[PDB]
Subunit: 151 residues, 2 copies
Protein backbone atom coordinates (compact mmCIF):
# COMPACT_ATOMS: atom_id res chain seq x y z
CA UNK A 1 0.00 0.00 0.00
CA UNK A 2 1.46 3.49 -0.72
CA UNK A 3 1.66 5.84 2.25
CA UNK A 4 1.93 9.62 2.07
CA UNK A 5 1.98 12.52 4.51
CA UNK A 6 1.42 16.27 4.40
CA UNK A 7 2.49 18.87 6.97
CA UNK A 8 0.34 22.02 6.79
CA UNK A 9 1.62 25.52 7.45
CA UNK A 10 0.82 28.99 6.12
CA UNK A 11 0.14 32.66 6.86
CA UNK A 12 -1.92 31.90 9.91
CA UNK A 13 -1.59 29.94 13.16
CA UNK A 14 -3.10 26.83 11.55
CA UNK A 15 -1.00 23.67 11.62
CA UNK A 16 -1.53 19.95 11.30
CA UNK A 17 -0.40 16.68 9.80
CA UNK A 18 -2.42 14.66 7.32
CA UNK A 19 -1.73 11.01 6.53
CA UNK A 20 -2.88 9.30 3.34
CA UNK A 21 -2.74 5.61 2.54
CA UNK A 22 -4.08 3.22 0.02
CA UNK A 23 -6.62 0.93 1.82
CA UNK A 24 -8.64 -1.46 -0.31
CA UNK A 25 -9.69 0.36 -3.50
CA UNK A 26 -9.73 3.85 -1.95
CA UNK A 27 -7.39 6.27 -0.19
CA UNK A 28 -7.87 6.83 3.55
CA UNK A 29 -7.11 10.34 4.75
CA UNK A 30 -6.58 10.97 8.48
CA UNK A 31 -5.16 13.63 10.74
CA UNK A 32 -5.78 16.70 12.86
CA UNK A 33 -5.70 20.42 11.96
CA UNK A 34 -5.47 22.96 14.76
CA UNK A 35 -5.79 26.71 15.19
CA UNK A 36 -8.99 27.00 13.14
CA UNK A 37 -12.04 29.08 13.85
CA UNK A 38 -14.86 26.73 14.94
CA UNK A 39 -16.97 25.39 12.08
CA UNK A 40 -16.50 24.13 8.55
CA UNK A 41 -13.35 24.89 6.53
CA UNK A 42 -12.81 23.86 2.92
CA UNK A 43 -10.18 21.16 2.37
CA UNK A 44 -8.87 20.12 -1.04
CA UNK A 45 -6.05 18.72 -3.08
CA UNK A 46 -4.63 21.55 -5.20
CA UNK A 47 -2.75 20.90 -8.41
CA UNK A 48 0.79 22.08 -7.68
CA UNK A 49 3.26 21.13 -4.96
CA UNK A 50 4.69 24.62 -5.33
CA UNK A 51 5.38 26.67 -2.20
CA UNK A 52 7.29 29.51 -3.89
CA UNK A 53 4.44 31.95 -3.21
CA UNK A 54 2.91 30.65 0.04
CA UNK A 55 -0.24 28.65 -0.53
CA UNK A 56 -1.16 30.75 -3.60
CA UNK A 57 1.34 28.94 -5.84
CA UNK A 58 -0.47 25.64 -5.19
CA UNK A 59 -2.83 26.69 -7.99
CA UNK A 60 -6.43 25.56 -8.20
CA UNK A 61 -8.16 22.38 -7.22
CA UNK A 62 -6.68 19.27 -8.78
CA UNK A 63 -8.99 18.58 -11.71
CA UNK A 64 -7.55 16.09 -14.18
CA UNK A 65 -11.06 15.16 -15.40
CA UNK A 66 -12.28 18.66 -16.20
CA UNK A 67 -15.27 18.65 -13.86
CA UNK A 68 -16.94 21.43 -11.87
CA UNK A 69 -16.37 21.88 -8.14
CA UNK A 70 -18.65 19.65 -6.07
CA UNK A 71 -19.09 17.62 -2.94
CA UNK A 72 -16.95 14.49 -2.29
CA UNK A 73 -19.96 12.21 -2.88
CA UNK A 74 -20.65 13.72 -6.32
CA UNK A 75 -19.68 12.45 -9.76
CA UNK A 76 -19.28 16.03 -11.00
CA UNK A 77 -16.45 17.04 -8.68
CA UNK A 78 -12.78 17.87 -8.95
CA UNK A 79 -10.56 14.93 -8.08
CA UNK A 80 -9.26 17.14 -5.26
CA UNK A 81 -12.68 17.90 -3.70
CA UNK A 82 -12.60 16.64 -0.11
CA UNK A 83 -15.36 18.92 1.19
CA UNK A 84 -14.95 20.45 4.62
CA UNK A 85 -13.17 19.67 7.81
CA UNK A 86 -15.13 20.59 10.94
CA UNK A 87 -13.25 22.40 13.69
CA UNK A 88 -14.70 22.09 17.14
CA UNK A 89 -15.13 24.93 19.56
CA UNK A 90 -11.48 24.33 20.53
CA UNK A 91 -10.29 25.05 16.99
CA UNK A 92 -9.30 21.48 16.18
CA UNK A 93 -10.61 19.42 13.27
CA UNK A 94 -10.02 15.70 12.82
CA UNK A 95 -10.12 13.93 9.50
CA UNK A 96 -11.02 10.37 8.83
CA UNK A 97 -12.35 9.78 5.37
CA UNK A 98 -12.09 7.33 2.48
CA UNK A 99 -12.10 8.72 -1.04
CA UNK A 100 -12.36 7.05 -4.41
CA UNK A 101 -10.99 9.82 -6.62
CA UNK A 102 -7.85 10.68 -4.58
CA UNK A 103 -5.07 8.38 -5.83
CA UNK A 104 -1.50 7.75 -4.66
CA UNK A 105 -0.38 6.14 -7.91
CA UNK A 106 -1.24 6.31 -11.58
CA UNK A 107 -2.15 9.30 -13.75
CA UNK A 108 -4.29 10.91 -11.02
CA UNK A 109 -1.72 10.52 -8.26
CA UNK A 110 -1.64 13.36 -5.73
CA UNK A 111 1.95 12.64 -4.69
CA UNK A 112 3.79 15.93 -5.07
CA UNK A 113 0.58 17.96 -5.09
CA UNK A 114 -0.76 20.11 -2.19
CA UNK A 115 -3.40 19.95 0.51
CA UNK A 116 -4.98 23.30 1.43
CA UNK A 117 -7.26 24.21 4.33
CA UNK A 118 -9.33 27.34 3.78
CA UNK A 119 -10.58 30.39 5.67
CA UNK A 120 -14.23 29.70 4.86
CA UNK A 121 -16.66 26.83 4.34
CA UNK A 122 -16.73 25.03 1.01
CA UNK A 123 -20.33 25.42 -0.28
CA UNK A 124 -19.95 22.22 -2.33
CA UNK A 125 -20.83 24.00 -5.54
CA UNK A 126 -24.32 24.90 -4.23
CA UNK A 127 -23.88 28.30 -2.63
CA UNK A 128 -25.06 30.43 -5.52
CA UNK A 129 -21.82 32.47 -5.84
CA UNK A 130 -19.66 32.92 -8.90
CA UNK A 131 -16.85 30.94 -7.22
CA UNK A 132 -19.17 28.13 -6.00
CA UNK A 133 -18.61 25.88 -9.04
CA UNK A 134 -14.86 26.80 -9.08
CA UNK A 135 -13.68 26.65 -5.47
CA UNK A 136 -16.81 26.23 -3.36
CA UNK A 137 -16.31 29.87 -2.42
CA UNK A 138 -13.99 28.72 0.37
CA UNK A 139 -11.96 31.94 0.46
CA UNK A 140 -8.31 32.25 1.31
CA UNK A 141 -5.77 29.67 2.32
CA UNK A 142 -4.85 29.25 5.96
CA UNK A 143 -2.25 26.52 5.55
CA UNK A 144 -0.97 24.05 3.00
CA UNK A 145 1.71 21.43 2.43
CA UNK A 146 3.18 19.29 -0.28
CA UNK A 147 2.06 15.64 -0.26
CA UNK A 148 5.10 13.44 0.19
CA UNK A 149 5.95 9.75 0.21
CA UNK A 150 6.48 8.23 3.63
CA UNK A 151 7.08 4.84 5.18
Amino acid sequence: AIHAVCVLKGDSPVTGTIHLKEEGDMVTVTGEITGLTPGKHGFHVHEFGDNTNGCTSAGGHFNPHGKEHGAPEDENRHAGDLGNVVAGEDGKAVINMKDKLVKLTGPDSVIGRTLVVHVDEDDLGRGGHEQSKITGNAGGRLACGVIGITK
Copy 2:
Protein backbone atom coordinates in the same frame (compact mmCIF):
# COMPACT_ATOMS: atom_id res chain seq x y z
CA ALA B 1 8.39 17.61 -19.99
CA ILE B 2 7.59 17.24 -16.24
CA HIS B 3 8.51 20.22 -14.06
CA ALA B 4 9.01 20.13 -10.30
CA VAL B 5 10.09 22.54 -7.59
CA CYS B 6 11.39 22.35 -4.03
CA VAL B 7 11.45 25.10 -1.40
CA LEU B 8 14.13 24.50 1.24
CA LYS B 9 13.78 25.44 4.88
CA GLY B 10 15.02 24.00 8.18
CA ASP B 11 16.59 24.61 11.59
CA SER B 12 19.03 27.15 10.27
CA PRO B 13 18.96 30.38 8.25
CA VAL B 14 19.42 28.46 4.98
CA THR B 15 16.75 28.95 2.33
CA GLY B 16 16.41 28.49 -1.40
CA THR B 17 14.33 27.24 -4.29
CA ILE B 18 15.32 24.38 -6.55
CA HIS B 19 13.72 23.72 -9.93
CA LEU B 20 13.80 20.35 -11.67
CA LYS B 21 12.72 19.56 -15.21
CA GLU B 22 12.98 16.80 -17.69
CA GLU B 23 15.29 17.99 -20.54
CA GLY B 24 16.27 15.47 -23.18
CA ASP B 25 17.01 12.14 -21.44
CA MET B 26 18.11 13.68 -18.13
CA VAL B 27 16.74 15.92 -15.38
CA THR B 28 18.08 19.47 -15.12
CA VAL B 29 18.35 20.83 -11.59
CA THR B 30 18.75 24.59 -11.07
CA GLY B 31 18.43 27.13 -8.30
CA GLU B 32 20.10 29.09 -5.54
CA ILE B 33 20.62 28.26 -1.84
CA THR B 34 21.52 31.07 0.55
CA GLY B 35 22.71 31.45 4.12
CA LEU B 36 25.40 28.76 3.86
CA THR B 37 28.91 28.83 5.22
CA PRO B 38 31.33 29.28 2.29
CA GLY B 39 32.48 26.03 0.69
CA LYS B 40 31.03 22.66 -0.25
CA HIS B 41 27.77 21.36 1.24
CA GLY B 42 26.29 17.94 0.54
CA PHE B 43 23.09 17.95 -1.53
CA HIS B 44 20.93 14.88 -2.10
CA VAL B 45 17.51 13.47 -2.78
CA HIS B 46 16.32 11.73 0.39
CA GLU B 47 13.73 8.98 0.31
CA PHE B 48 10.74 10.45 2.15
CA GLY B 49 8.74 13.63 1.59
CA ASP B 50 8.04 13.60 5.31
CA ASN B 51 8.46 16.82 7.29
CA THR B 52 6.88 15.60 10.55
CA ASN B 53 10.26 15.68 12.31
CA GLY B 54 12.12 18.52 10.56
CA CYS B 55 14.59 17.28 7.99
CA THR B 56 15.29 14.10 10.01
CA SER B 57 12.05 12.43 8.87
CA ALA B 58 13.21 12.65 5.24
CA GLY B 59 15.11 9.42 5.93
CA GLY B 60 18.27 8.44 4.10
CA HIS B 61 19.45 9.01 0.59
CA PHE B 62 17.06 7.78 -2.07
CA ASN B 63 18.51 4.41 -3.07
CA PRO B 64 16.10 2.29 -5.08
CA HIS B 65 19.01 0.34 -6.64
CA GLY B 66 20.76 -0.67 -3.43
CA LYS B 67 24.08 0.98 -4.18
CA GLU B 68 26.68 2.60 -1.91
CA HIS B 69 27.00 6.37 -1.55
CA GLY B 70 29.13 7.89 -4.30
CA ALA B 71 29.76 10.84 -6.54
CA PRO B 72 27.19 11.90 -9.20
CA GLU B 73 29.46 10.66 -12.01
CA ASP B 74 29.73 7.17 -10.50
CA GLU B 75 27.83 4.00 -11.36
CA ASN B 76 27.95 2.90 -7.71
CA ARG B 77 25.94 5.78 -6.26
CA HIS B 78 22.56 6.30 -4.68
CA ALA B 79 19.99 7.60 -7.15
CA GLY B 80 19.79 10.65 -4.86
CA ASP B 81 23.54 11.46 -4.91
CA LEU B 82 23.94 14.97 -6.32
CA GLY B 83 27.32 15.67 -4.72
CA ASN B 84 27.96 19.12 -3.33
CA VAL B 85 26.75 22.61 -3.89
CA VAL B 86 29.46 25.27 -3.56
CA ALA B 87 28.62 28.36 -1.54
CA GLY B 88 30.64 31.42 -2.33
CA GLU B 89 32.16 33.72 0.23
CA ASP B 90 28.74 35.44 0.35
CA GLY B 91 27.03 32.24 1.48
CA LYS B 92 25.16 31.62 -1.77
CA ALA B 93 25.38 28.48 -3.89
CA VAL B 94 23.93 28.14 -7.39
CA ILE B 95 22.97 24.86 -8.96
CA ASN B 96 22.94 23.99 -12.58
CA MET B 97 23.37 20.32 -13.25
CA LYS B 98 22.00 17.54 -15.45
CA ASP B 99 21.59 14.10 -13.91
CA LYS B 100 20.79 10.74 -15.41
CA LEU B 101 19.61 8.89 -12.30
CA VAL B 102 17.22 11.56 -10.92
CA LYS B 103 13.81 10.91 -12.54
CA LEU B 104 10.51 12.80 -12.48
CA THR B 105 8.43 9.86 -13.65
CA GLY B 106 8.53 6.08 -13.46
CA PRO B 107 9.60 3.79 -10.62
CA ASP B 108 12.54 6.02 -9.64
CA SER B 109 10.57 9.26 -9.62
CA VAL B 110 11.62 11.77 -6.98
CA ILE B 111 8.25 13.55 -6.99
CA GLY B 112 7.10 13.59 -3.38
CA ARG B 113 10.60 12.91 -2.06
CA THR B 114 12.93 15.47 -0.38
CA LEU B 115 15.98 17.55 -1.23
CA VAL B 116 18.38 18.14 1.67
CA VAL B 117 21.35 20.50 1.94
CA HIS B 118 23.88 19.55 4.61
CA VAL B 119 26.11 21.15 7.23
CA ASP B 120 29.29 19.58 5.85
CA GLU B 121 30.89 18.54 2.57
CA ASP B 122 29.89 15.25 0.98
CA ASP B 123 33.15 13.23 0.68
CA LEU B 124 31.68 11.29 -2.26
CA GLY B 125 32.24 7.98 -0.53
CA ARG B 126 36.04 8.52 -0.44
CA GLY B 127 36.67 10.21 2.90
CA GLY B 128 37.65 7.15 4.89
CA HIS B 129 34.93 7.54 7.56
CA GLU B 130 32.32 5.01 8.60
CA GLN B 131 29.57 7.24 7.16
CA SER B 132 31.44 7.91 3.87
CA LYS B 133 29.80 5.05 1.96
CA ILE B 134 26.41 5.81 3.62
CA THR B 135 25.99 9.58 3.53
CA GLY B 136 29.33 10.98 2.36
CA ASN B 137 29.81 12.03 5.98
CA ALA B 138 27.93 15.24 5.18
CA GLY B 139 26.69 15.79 8.74
CA GLY B 140 23.44 17.39 9.75
CA ARG B 141 20.67 18.90 7.70
CA LEU B 142 20.46 22.65 7.28
CA ALA B 143 17.31 22.77 5.17
CA CYS B 144 15.03 20.54 3.16
CA GLY B 145 11.80 20.52 1.18
CA VAL B 146 9.38 18.17 -0.47
CA ILE B 147 9.69 17.92 -4.27
CA GLY B 148 6.41 18.99 -5.82
CA ILE B 149 4.82 19.16 -9.25
CA THR B 150 4.69 22.60 -10.80
CA LYS B 151 3.72 24.22 -14.08
